[PDB]
Design an enzyme around this catalytic site. Structure first.
Site, PDB file in Angstrom:
ATOM      1  N   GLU B 278       0.821  -1.205   0.000  1.00  0.00           N
ATOM      2  CA  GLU B 278       0.000   0.000   0.000  1.00  0.00           C
ATOM      3  C   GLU B 278       0.857   1.258   0.000  1.00  0.00           C
ATOM      4  O   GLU B 278       0.511   2.244  -0.656  1.00  0.00           O
ATOM      5  CB  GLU B 278      -0.941  -0.005   1.204  1.00  0.00           C
ATOM      6  CG  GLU B 278      -2.073  -1.015   1.107  1.00  0.00           C
ATOM      7  CD  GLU B 278      -3.034  -0.925   2.278  1.00  0.00           C
ATOM      8  OE1 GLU B 278      -2.716  -0.216   3.256  1.00  0.00           O
ATOM      9  OE2 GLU B 278      -4.106  -1.563   2.220  1.00  0.00           O
ATOM     10  N   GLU B 281       2.197   1.723  -3.489  1.00  0.00           N
ATOM     11  CA  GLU B 281       1.123   2.199  -4.355  1.00  0.00           C
ATOM     12  C   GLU B 281       0.817   3.671  -4.101  1.00  0.00           C
ATOM     13  O   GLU B 281       0.607   4.440  -5.044  1.00  0.00           O
ATOM     14  CB  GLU B 281      -0.129   1.347  -4.148  1.00  0.00           C
ATOM     15  CG  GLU B 281      -1.153   1.461  -5.261  1.00  0.00           C
ATOM     16  CD  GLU B 281      -2.349   0.555  -5.045  1.00  0.00           C
ATOM     17  OE1 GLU B 281      -2.401  -0.120  -3.997  1.00  0.00           O
ATOM     18  OE2 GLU B 281      -3.236   0.518  -5.923  1.00  0.00           O
ATOM     19  N   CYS B 298      -9.043  -2.686   3.454  1.00  0.00           N
ATOM     20  CA  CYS B 298      -8.891  -3.769   4.416  1.00  0.00           C
ATOM     21  C   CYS B 298     -10.201  -4.170   5.080  1.00  0.00           C
ATOM     22  O   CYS B 298     -10.254  -5.232   5.709  1.00  0.00           O
ATOM     23  CB  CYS B 298      -7.874  -3.373   5.490  1.00  0.00           C
ATOM     24  SG  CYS B 298      -6.277  -2.831   4.842  1.00  0.00           S
ATOM     25  N   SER B 318      -7.952   1.371  -3.239  1.00  0.00           N
ATOM     26  CA  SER B 318      -6.716   0.612  -3.363  1.00  0.00           C
ATOM     27  C   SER B 318      -7.023  -0.846  -3.687  1.00  0.00           C
ATOM     28  O   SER B 318      -7.963  -1.435  -3.147  1.00  0.00           O
ATOM     29  CB  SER B 318      -5.902   0.709  -2.075  1.00  0.00           C
ATOM     30  OG  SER B 318      -4.798  -0.177  -2.102  1.00  0.00           O
ATOM     31  N   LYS B 357     -15.721 -11.032   7.383  1.00  0.00           N
ATOM     32  CA  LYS B 357     -14.718 -11.972   6.894  1.00  0.00           C
ATOM     33  C   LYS B 357     -15.341 -13.305   6.506  1.00  0.00           C
ATOM     34  O   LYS B 357     -14.878 -13.952   5.560  1.00  0.00           O
ATOM     35  CB  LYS B 357     -13.633 -12.182   7.950  1.00  0.00           C
ATOM     36  CG  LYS B 357     -12.820 -10.940   8.265  1.00  0.00           C
ATOM     37  CD  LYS B 357     -11.986 -10.519   7.070  1.00  0.00           C
ATOM     38  CE  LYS B 357     -11.032  -9.396   7.428  1.00  0.00           C
ATOM     39  NZ  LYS B 357     -10.319  -8.873   6.230  1.00  0.00           N
ATOM     40  N   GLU B 360     -16.520 -12.638   3.154  1.00  0.00           N
ATOM     41  CA  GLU B 360     -15.406 -12.361   2.252  1.00  0.00           C
ATOM     42  C   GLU B 360     -14.681 -13.634   1.838  1.00  0.00           C
ATOM     43  O   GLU B 360     -14.208 -13.736   0.702  1.00  0.00           O
ATOM     44  CB  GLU B 360     -14.427 -11.390   2.911  1.00  0.00           C
ATOM     45  CG  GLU B 360     -13.355 -10.862   1.976  1.00  0.00           C
ATOM     46  CD  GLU B 360     -12.096 -10.443   2.708  1.00  0.00           C
ATOM     47  OE1 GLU B 360     -11.491 -11.296   3.389  1.00  0.00           O
ATOM     48  OE2 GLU B 360     -11.709  -9.261   2.600  1.00  0.00           O
ATOM     49  N   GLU B 365     -13.738 -14.518  -6.490  1.00  0.00           N
ATOM     50  CA  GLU B 365     -12.505 -13.992  -7.064  1.00  0.00           C
ATOM     51  C   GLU B 365     -11.256 -14.483  -6.341  1.00  0.00           C
ATOM     52  O   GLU B 365     -10.156 -14.371  -6.891  1.00  0.00           O
ATOM     53  CB  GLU B 365     -12.532 -12.463  -7.060  1.00  0.00           C
ATOM     54  CG  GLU B 365     -12.586 -11.847  -5.671  1.00  0.00           C
ATOM     55  CD  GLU B 365     -13.257 -10.489  -5.660  1.00  0.00           C
ATOM     56  OE1 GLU B 365     -12.896  -9.639  -6.502  1.00  0.00           O
ATOM     57  OE2 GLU B 365     -14.145 -10.270  -4.809  1.00  0.00           O
ATOM     58  N   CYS B 500     -11.567  -2.477  14.879  1.00  0.00           N
ATOM     59  CA  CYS B 500     -11.896  -3.897  14.885  1.00  0.00           C
ATOM     60  C   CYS B 500     -12.076  -4.463  16.286  1.00  0.00           C
ATOM     61  O   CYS B 500     -12.596  -5.575  16.418  1.00  0.00           O
ATOM     62  CB  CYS B 500     -10.817  -4.688  14.144  1.00  0.00           C
ATOM     63  SG  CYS B 500     -10.800  -4.422  12.358  1.00  0.00           S
TER      64      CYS B 500
HETATM   65  O1  HC1 Z   1      -8.013  -8.394   6.853  1.00  0.00           O
HETATM   66  C1  HC1 Z   1      -7.744  -7.789   7.767  1.00  0.00           C
HETATM   67 FE1  HC1 Z   1      -7.335  -6.875   9.291  1.00  0.00          FE
HETATM   68  O2  HC1 Z   1      -7.301  -2.548   9.081  1.00  0.00           O
HETATM   69  C2  HC1 Z   1      -8.498  -5.464   8.987  1.00  0.00           C
HETATM   70  O3  HC1 Z   1      -9.247  -4.637   8.866  1.00  0.00           O
HETATM   71  S1  HC1 Z   1      -6.978  -6.003  11.418  1.00  0.00           S
HETATM   72 FE2  HC1 Z   1      -7.604  -8.235  11.422  1.00  0.00          FE
HETATM   73  O4  HC1 Z   1      -7.184  -6.883  14.505  1.00  0.00           O
HETATM   74  C3  HC1 Z   1      -7.920  -9.927  11.019  1.00  0.00           C
HETATM   75  O5  HC1 Z   1      -8.009 -11.047  10.747  1.00  0.00           O
HETATM   76  C4  HC1 Z   1      -9.139  -7.901  12.395  1.00  0.00           C
HETATM   77  O6  HC1 Z   1     -10.096  -7.721  12.923  1.00  0.00           O
HETATM   78  S2  HC1 Z   1      -5.774  -8.438   9.992  1.00  0.00           S
HETATM   79  C5  HC1 Z   1      -9.026  -7.774   9.970  1.00  0.00           C
HETATM   80  O7  HC1 Z   1     -10.100  -7.563   9.909  1.00  0.00           O
HETATM   81  S1  SF4 Z   2     -14.400  -5.790  12.597  1.00  0.00           S
HETATM   82 FE1  SF4 Z   2     -15.526  -4.004  11.737  1.00  0.00          FE
HETATM   83  S2  SF4 Z   2     -13.879  -2.553  11.122  1.00  0.00           S
HETATM   84 FE2  SF4 Z   2     -12.867  -4.571  11.429  1.00  0.00          FE
HETATM   85  S3  SF4 Z   2     -12.866  -5.518   9.356  1.00  0.00           S
HETATM   86 FE3  SF4 Z   2     -14.756  -6.258  10.395  1.00  0.00          FE
HETATM   87  S4  SF4 Z   2     -16.360  -4.771   9.758  1.00  0.00           S
HETATM   88 FE4  SF4 Z   2     -14.360  -3.797   9.272  1.00  0.00          FE
END
Ligand code: HC1
Ligand code: SF4
Ligand SMILES: NC(=O)c1ccc[n+]([C@@H]2O[C@H](COP(=O)([O-])OP(=O)(O)OC[C@H]3O[C@@H](n4cnc5c(N)ncnc54)[C@H](OP(=O)(O)O)[C@@H]3O)[C@@H](O)[C@H]2O)c1
Ligand SMILES: Cc1cc2nc3c(=O)[nH]c(=O)nc-3n(C[C@H](O)[C@H](O)[C@H](O)COP(=O)(O)O)c2cc1C
Ligand code: SF4
Ligand code: SF4
Ligand code: SF4
Ligand code: SF4
Ligand code: SF4
Ligand code: SF4
Ligand code: FES
Ligand code: FES
Ligand code: FES
Ligand SMILES: [Zn+2]
Lengths: 630, 571, 151
Positions: B278, B281, B298, B318, B357, B360, B365, B500
């Site tokens: 990043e 970039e 992210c 990005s 996640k 995701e 993809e 997070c």
């Molecule tokens: O992908 C990624 Fe990440 O600005 C981000 O966002 S931080 Fe993680 O403490 C993990 O797993 C967490 O929670 S590594 C993610 O979510």
């Molecule tokens: S915990 Fe919240 S801020 Fe962190 S990756 Fe997931 S949705 Fe985004």
């Protein structure tokens, strides 16, 4: 319909309207109310105008408009609002003969024109004949129904075309606003306070206090809302008020807006009422065309605008915060207090919400003074009220009496006793939020204090009479079912307890009731009343609690003995076979799926109550019909 | 600051004007029960379970009642207790009661209140709630356990400003639903998970993948590797009776080793790799001066929000993958060849405190880089199931050669850490010297405010930078940017307020000060590492010099970059 | 769809005011007979209100229904002045003859039942109002003849 720029020009045109009306000789009035329209009053009017046209009467018109002022008509046909006596509509009045006709039929129109119009005669067969006494009455005021009534709010009802503004002008209307425009706001507010007016919506909160509270607020924008929801079934007061004269409530709204200083206002009506909304829109457009609504009213600088918002259902939408949310366009869920709508209501601005009847009485107070108004009724509650009495009574209609009249002559003298010569049992006052009053308390005068003392509430103003035929448990169940249906389901107490009470009542009324249900019902009612959020759940258990208090023996008979004293609950019917009238047909034994009846041919049969389902198949299938529902 | 006089249970109290009865009585050590109110939301008045008795003798709700002079309040009179018991009996008369099968067992609030307020025999037995349960992706919704408190709707409308759910029907048959009961995927949901974090019952829950992990562990022809998120090591100890913000890294590594995982790594290596990509970039974009501003990628929920509501910002996003997918690609493309394991016989598991996640990991993809995703609560449940005691464990270290990390990658679990690390690397790249002393910390981007702005001067060149934690603040910043009031160069967005550490997969809390404690713990963990820069990592240099040979290279662009498409279903 | 132009016809008339979602819903129901799905989504797209709010408002009130009806709609009073004199038996007779419960339609056929409370005329015993005409005094025996007359 030219614009106006001076206050005196209205009175100048008043004389022209008065002369134009005086140029007429014969006037006929036909009730245009919903109850009479359901009987075919429009067809009667069409037939009458057709016969008049055939008979050479060239000057016949239906609506008095601006172009009608230059036309002299020998015979005029009117269409007024509800006249009050809905029992035997349609209603027709002929002047200057002063004859009151009931039950007018289209095929009687020709005879009416031949005799009542041309010969100035009267037909006794079409006049009212009271079966109680047999006396024949001619004039409307001589009728016992209208004898005890002091019409104040409905003074213009039944004699003014609701779709004509000039007719309203000719009766002296639109003068209260002209007089008030020369006075200060504080003078009007203090006059209203001194009048002793109280809210007619049931709560009884003083109007003057709310108006003063709105006056003391220094905000750029303020709002006024007129409430015409009428969610209570069996009550049709504001319906007839709007269908009779919207100009009165428009004048009251303008007076209130001038008093508090608001340039906008709304009229909340339910879309289920087509005639009312049509008449209101027509009146508003006529008033705007005439120039009394808009900017710089009569050169004073007062600005006012009126809007109509058609309702879309729920009984709970009448509540103030729910009404504001419905107007904004969201779900009608009541919000939490404080703050109140008198500090930040519609769009977070101060608002004043009043009933239709409350806004209808303001011009009378302005014209005649509050001291004159305060001389009627009890000192702590002045004015009058409009009651819509119906049910198992001889005469049903809209009555208006001074506030304080005793209940006994209201039920009997005006109502003409109980129909079918039965015995009076009880009356329901206030609707689903009110209580049940037995025969022992008929000598109670009507006012807020006494009704609040007796556990009932004023409510909308509906009165329903029931005789000894009906079962009280079923009546309470019906009211509880309506309350369960009309809930909104936001807080735990109302939403859960209403259904629990309905289930308990159904269990009791199906014969499966168990000992100890009355105490549980009372505890549920107490908790629901204490811990509810809005006013719909706080008044919900009142019909059940009143019935339990006054008719506990009915519940005891239903629970302990599995018998209905009034014989109205089908699941507790106990058929009895008469040995004398029995021929041993055996049809009851054959048709019953469970066959609880066993007996010999050509001999009386015996019903086993243990194995019977009480579906009624036995009685309706045997030709002799000796099995009676006992 | 004007104080008022009142009497609560015979004790005089000094509170400011405007404070409710609940917050006023909280200072006397009195906890009034309540189910429909939260510290993030306005009072609602739905449960009616916090009623108190005043001097007149009526029951008034104490959660939305302002305080007044000369007020007498009784909180434990028999009438109040009777009313509360009746209300809870009314609730429990229509509850489907699989507390054996309920995910929220031993964590439910309705169950705890039923225990405390002494319920033993329900008198109201009759009709219950009965609906149909349907799959909504990574979120499990059971309308048979709903109490209609409105917390999910209020959190989605007032705070998130998304408005994906609302009430439906009325009366006894009311329930929460999307338009026409459509699945959440094609609704306006962005999968942040804040509604799951505030629900007091087991109506809203998670979709578990534990059985697949167990069936892959028992398979004798597969190798299982696990990666741990930076924010899991400060909130995992809460489930075992510790205070928030206590570091349990060694204990959790030992527990994971005892669970059967062959190799245990950490995501901070991928965090450093993403930081390098990043920063390169961003430097190239600044040199070119095109497509400004640049947004991070992210957060999967932020990407979903861009794809659904703001499809015109796609060229500005990005293209670097999230650390989870980067780690998955590294494990399945480079580590396997070094060890000698076929790509089809490798299993990758991730422990994340997030819910986006889970969605995701299933995108087409990514070619199924990550096979399963867990949460902190699922990991705690697994640890308790296996029987390992957490208090008396022995500290251990991460495996090799993808285990060592730095301090710049340890602050991705809090808002503003990614920006601070990016600035740390960018200063070194742009100038050539290394920050020393207290200049490493950028205190102007730290805190818990809505929109944080700064202007960092790098050897005479000024950069406009911004941080916006939360979807509502993101929308406000987008509206500010589009109108042309000012121009930026780099913008960070996170869907959860506070970073997070406030994700939907974290253990439940009752303390109103969990955010501050967790942020303090994260900063303390960062402060105790030997390296505090991303370019000082040693294994990243080896990975570059052995496989990719340069950041933003053809192989890197093929394996460490992605593209986005518009999801705006026009109606 | 060609009805998106008819929707836009009233999206410019009754949408110059502030907060007119319910009026738009009523106009849409009047035009289309019922209240469909793609129309709701088009309103949400063209007015800014999220579809969840519109769906909640539509599901709140009993006037709005999201399923096509028949041609002749039947209404029974079931009010506080007509329930006393046996309106429940009239409703039971209607349900037995039509084979459909109250509030449910026979869409294959053209009939429909409804539960509108306390119509305008209260003095005409229990009052059944089919389509646009008033009947008056009713008995469970007139049900068969009136249904035969319409059918
Ligand atoms: O992908 C990624 Fe990440 O600005 C981000 O966002 S931080 Fe993680 O403490 C993990 O797993 C967490 O929670 S590594 C993610 O979510
Ligand atoms: S915990 Fe919240 S801020 Fe962190 S990756 Fe997931 S949705 Fe985004
Ligand atoms: N069909 C009917 O007509 C019907 C049916 C059921 C019940 N009711 C009656 O309605 C009553 C409940 O009505 P409600 O709950 O809507 O009204 P309420 O709370 O009893 O108060 C009535 C009026 O007071 C107003 N008000 C404004 N400022 C005030 C202040 N400072 N202090 C007190 N009141 C203020 C209220 O506005 P806000 O509330 O907006 O502040 C409202 O307009 C029941 O007790 C019952 O008698 C009528
Ligand atoms: C459930 C419920 C229904 C109500 N319905 C009405 C109504 O139909 N008409 C009305 O004027 N007031 C109704 N009210 C009372 C209103 O809240 C409001 O207080 C009243 O309009 C005030 O007018 P007033 O100040 O003239 O009394 C209702 C209240 C409740 C709780
Ligand atoms: S008491 Fe009943 S009607 Fe009133 S808000 Fe509560 S649930 Fe709705
Ligand atoms: S209906 Fe009459 S005749 Fe027939 S079995 Fe009964 S009592 Fe006898
Ligand atoms: S309904 Fe009862 S009494 Fe009549 S035939 Fe059947 S079992 Fe006998
Ligand atoms: S996950 Fe987020 S966007 Fe989706 S319903 Fe819950 S709070 Fe709303
Ligand atoms: S789903 Fe959970 S948060 Fe939403 S209303 Fe139901 S119980 Fe409350
Ligand atoms: S939501 Fe709570 S009370 Fe209901 S089953 Fe789950 S744990 Fe038990
Ligand atoms: S409607 Fe005609 S008298 Fe009432
Ligand atoms: S917490 Fe007060 S009503 Fe729910
Ligand atoms: S109660 Fe039947 S129409 Fe009013
Ligand atoms: Zn009975």
């Amino acid at each position: 319909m030219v614009k106006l720029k001076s206050i005196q020009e209205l009175e100048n045109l008043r004389e022209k309207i008065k002369e134009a009306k005086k140029k007429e000789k014969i006037v006929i009035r036909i009730c245009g109310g919903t109850g009479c329209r359901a009987s075919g009053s429009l067809a009667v009017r069409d037939e009458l105008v057709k016969v008049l046209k055939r008979e050479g009467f060239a000057n016949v018109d239906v609506n008095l408009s601006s172009d009608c002022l230059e036309n002299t008509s020998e015979v005029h046909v009117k269409m007024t609002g509800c006249q009050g006596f809905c029992a035997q509509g349609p209603l027709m009045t002929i002047e200057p003969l002063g004859v009151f006709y009931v039950g007018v039929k289209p095929e009687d129109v020709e005879e009416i024109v031949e005799k009542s119009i041309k010969k100035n005669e009267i037909i006794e067969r079409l006049l009212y004949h009271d079966p109680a006494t047999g006396k024949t009455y001619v004039k409307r005021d001589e009728n016992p129904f209208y004898a005890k009534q002091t019409r104040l709010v409905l003074k213009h009802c039944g004699t003014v075309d609701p779709a004509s503004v000039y007719d309203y002008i000719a009766e002296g209307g639109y003068s209260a606003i002209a007089k008030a425009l020369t006075m200060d706001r504080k003078q009007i507010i203090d006059e209203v306070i001194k009048s002793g007016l109280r809210g007619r919506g049931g709560a009884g909160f003083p109007t003057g206090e709310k108006w003063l509270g709105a006056y003391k607020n220094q905000s750029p924008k303020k709002y006024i809302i007129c409430n015409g929801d009428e969610g209570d079934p069996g009550a049709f007061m504001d319906r007839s008020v709007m269908e009779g004269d919207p100009h009165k409530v428009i004048e009251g709204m303008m007076i209130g807006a001038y008093a508090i200083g608001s340039d906008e206002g709304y009229i909340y009506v339910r879309a289920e009422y087509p005639l009312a909304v049509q008449m209101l829109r027509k009146a508003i457009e006529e008033c705007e065309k005439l120039g009394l609504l808009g900017d710089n009213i009569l050169g004073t600088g007062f600005s006012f605008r009126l809007h109509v918002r058609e309702g879309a259902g729920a009984f709970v939408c009448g509540e103030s915060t729910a009404l504001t949310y419905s107007i904004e366009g969201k779900r009608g869920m009541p919000r939490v207090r404080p703050p109140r709508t008198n500090e930040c209501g519609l769009w977070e601005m101060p608002t004043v919400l009043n009933n239709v009847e409350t806004f209808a009485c303001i011009p009378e107070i302005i014209l005649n003074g509050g001291e004159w108004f305060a001389s009627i009724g009890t000192p702590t509650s002045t004015g009058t009220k409009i009651f819509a009495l119906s049910g198992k009574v001889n005469r049903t209609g809209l009555v208006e009496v001074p506030m304080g009249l005793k209940l006994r002559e209201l039920i009997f003298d005006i109502g003409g006793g109980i129909a079918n010569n039965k015995k009076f049992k009880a009356v329901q006052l206030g609707g689903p939020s009110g209580g049940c009053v037995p025969e022992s308390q008929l000598d109670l005068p009507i006012d807020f204090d006494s009704l609040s003392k007796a556990g009932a509430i004023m409510g909308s103003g509906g009165v329903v009479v029931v005789d000894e035929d009906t079962c009280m448990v079923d009546f309470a169940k019906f009211f509880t079912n309506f309350i369960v249906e009309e809930s909104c389901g936001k807080c735990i107490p109302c939403r859960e307890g209403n259904k629990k009470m309905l289930e308990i009542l159904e269990r009791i009324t199906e014969g499966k009731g168990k000992e100890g249900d009355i105490e549980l019902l009372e505890e549920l009612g107490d908790v629901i009343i204490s811990a509810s959020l809005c006013g719909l759940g706080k008044t919900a258990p009142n019909p059940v609690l009143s019935t339990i208090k006054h008719f506990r023996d009915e519940y005891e008979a239903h629970i302990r003995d599995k018998k209905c004293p009034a014989g109205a609950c089908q699941a507790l019917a106990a058929y009895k076979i008469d040995p004398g009238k029995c021929i041993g047909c055996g049809k009851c034994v054959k048709v019953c799926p469970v066959g609880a009846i066993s007996g010999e041919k050509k001999k009386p049969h015996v019903i086993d109550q243990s194995k019977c389902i009480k579906c009624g198949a036995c009685a309706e299938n045997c030709p002799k019909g000796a099995i009676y529902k006992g | 600051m004007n104080m008022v006089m009142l009497t609560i249970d015979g004790k005089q109290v000094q509170v400011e004007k405007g404070t409710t009865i609940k917050k006023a009585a909280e200072k006397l050590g009195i906890e009034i029960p309540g189910l429909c109110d939260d510290n993030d939301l306005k009072p609602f008045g739905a449960c009616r379970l916090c009623v108190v008795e005043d001097a007149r003798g009526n029951l008034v709700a104490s959660c939305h009642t302002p305080v007044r002079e000369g007020m007498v309040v009784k909180t434990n009179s028999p009438k109040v207790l009777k009313a509360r018991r009746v209300i809870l009996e009314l609730l429990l008369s229509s509850h489907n009661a699989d507390c054996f099968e309920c995910d929220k067992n031993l964590h439910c609030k309705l169950q705890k209140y039923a225990y405390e307020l002494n319920i033993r025999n329900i008198r109201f037995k009759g009709e219950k709630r009965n609906y149909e349960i349907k799959d909504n992706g990574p979120i499990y919704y059971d309308p048979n356990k709903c109490i209609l408190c409105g917390k999910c709707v209020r959190i989605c409308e007032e705070v998130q400003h998304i408005c994906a759910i609302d009430f439906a029907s009325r009366g006894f048959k009311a329930y929460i639903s999307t338009p026409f009961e459509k699945p959440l995927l094609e609704s306006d949901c962005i999968f942040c998970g804040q509604c799951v974090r505030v629900c007091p019952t087991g109506a809203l829950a998670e979709k578990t993948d534990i059985e697949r992990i167990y069936e892959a562990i028992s398979d004798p022809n597969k190798v299982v590797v696990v990666q741990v998120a930076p924010a899991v090591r400060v909130a995992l100890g809460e489930e075992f009776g510790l205070e928030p913000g206590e570091i349990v890294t060694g204990k959790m590594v030992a527990a994971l080793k005892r669970l059967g995982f062959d190799k245990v790594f950490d995501t901070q290596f991928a965090a450093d790799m993403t930081i390098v990509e990043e920063t390169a970039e961003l430097v190239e974009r600044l040199e070119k001066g095109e497509n400004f501003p640049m947004f991070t990628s992210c957060c999967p929920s932020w990407i979903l929000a861009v794809e659904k509501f703001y499809p015109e910002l796609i060229p500005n996003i990005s293209t670097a993958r999230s650390p989870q997918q980067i780690f998955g690609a590294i494990a399945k493309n480079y580590y396997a060849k070094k060890i000698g394991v076929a790509r089809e016989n490798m299993f990758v598991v991730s422990v994340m405190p997030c819910i986006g996640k889970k969605f995701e990991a299933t995108r087409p993809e990514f070619n199924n880089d990550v096979d399963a995703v867990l949460t902190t609560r699922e990991l705690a449940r697994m640890i308790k199931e296996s029987g390992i005691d957490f208090i008396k464990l022995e500290e251990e270290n991460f495996d090799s050669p993808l285990g060592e990390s730095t301090g710049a990658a340890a602050i991705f679990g809090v808002t503003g850490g990614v920006m601070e690390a990016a600035l740390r690397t960018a200063y070194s790249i742009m100038t050539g010297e290394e920050l020393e002393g207290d200049k490493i910390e950028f205190t102007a981007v730290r805190g818990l405010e809505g929109i944080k702005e700064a202007e960092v001067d790098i050897k005479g060149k000024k950069v406009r930078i911004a941080i916006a934690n939360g979807i509502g603040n993101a929308k406000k910043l987008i509206e500010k940017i589009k109108s042309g009031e000012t121009k930026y160069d780099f913008v960070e967005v996170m869907a959860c307020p506070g970073g997070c550490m406030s994700g939907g997969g974290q253990p439940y809390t009752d303390d109103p000060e969990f955010r501050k404690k967790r942020m303090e713990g994260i900063y303390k963990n960062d402060r105790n590492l030997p390296k505090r820069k991303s370019h000082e990592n040693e294994e990243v240099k080896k990975v570059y010099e052995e496989y990719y040979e340069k950041p933003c290279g053809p192989k890197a662009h093929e394996e460490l970059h992605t593209h986005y498409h518009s999801r705006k279903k026009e109606y | 769809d060609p009805r998106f132009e008819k929707v836009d016809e009233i999206l410019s008339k009754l949408a110059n005011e502030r907060g007119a979602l319910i009026a738009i819903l009523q106009h849409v129901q009047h035009e289309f007979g019922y209240l469909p799905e793609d129309v709701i989504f088009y309103i949400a797209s063209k007015t800014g209100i999220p579809a969840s709010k519109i769906y909640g408002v539509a599901t709140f009130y009993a006037q709005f229904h999201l399923k096509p009806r028949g041609k002749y709609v039947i209404r029974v009073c079931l009010g506080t002045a007509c329930h006393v004199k046996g309106a429940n038996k009239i409703l039971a007779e209607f349900e037995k003859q039509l084979g459909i419960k109250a509030g449910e339609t026979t869409s294959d056929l053209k009939f429909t039942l409804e539960r509108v409370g306390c119509l305008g005329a209260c003095g005409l015993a229990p009052t059944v109002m089919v389509n646009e005409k008033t009947y008056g005094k009713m008995t469970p025996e007139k049900v068969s003849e009136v249904l035969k007359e319409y059918s």
